């Protein structure tokens, strides 16, 4: 169904959806693992299914069609804890490139392309546990898709060799965030 922001289970999957109160977003959970996002001149917004919790091994599939009109991105998305870590496997974006900005660690290879890894500090910014000042991890995807498996073990597996130690995973979702811009997207997670 059609809902406001917030955080539960559907028909098998854990979903989580928020946005930045500006409006232009509709947000629909559909039949299994499928979500459907629907914007249109929106402000900040982040919405999708997976688990609750994650875990470090998972191969994540997901399917459907994806057509931004602007800045968005589709990802595998979650947090751990201890340490604190947000996370991103960007797979498709639309005109920003995600890690812009973002100090770049490595490269890694997985499910058909390679990724570049970054690495970024958020300071006093909101987070599972509160305010609070964490890194957040990208593996961005050189050649852009809508559908396939991410193995998530290799990306963290990378990020690992590179420093980075996830504890306790919290939520995985695979995610449609929007930022200020238009479009549509219906993905099924499985």
Do not use: C
Not at 68 to 96: A, D, H, K, M, Q
Not at 148 to 176: C, K, R
């Amino acid at each position: 169904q059609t809902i406001q922001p917030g955080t539960g289970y559907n028909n098998g999957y854990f979903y989580s959806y928020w946005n930045d109160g500006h409006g232009g977003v509709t947000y629909t959970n559909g039949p299994g693992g499928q979500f459907s996002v629907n914007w249109s001149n929106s402000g900040n917004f982040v919405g999708g299914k997976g688990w609750q919790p994650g875990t470090k091994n998972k191969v994540i599939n997901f399917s459907g069609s994806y057509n931004p009109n602007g800045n968005s991105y589709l990802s595998v998305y979650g947090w751990s804890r201890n340490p604190l870590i947000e996370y991103y496997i960007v797979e498709n974006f639309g005109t920003y490139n995600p890690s812009t900005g973002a100090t770049k660690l490595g490269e890694v290879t997985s499910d058909g392309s390679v990724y570049d890894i970054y690495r970024t500090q958020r300071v006093n910014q909101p987070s599972i546990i509160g305010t609070a000042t964490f890194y957040q991890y990208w593996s961005v995807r050189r050649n852009h898709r809508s559908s396939g498996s991410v193995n998530t073990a290799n990306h963290f597996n990378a990020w690992a060799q590179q420093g980075l130690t996830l504890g306790t995973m919290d939520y995985q979702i695979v995610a449609v965030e929007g930022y200020f811009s238009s479009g549509s997207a219906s993905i099924t997670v499985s």
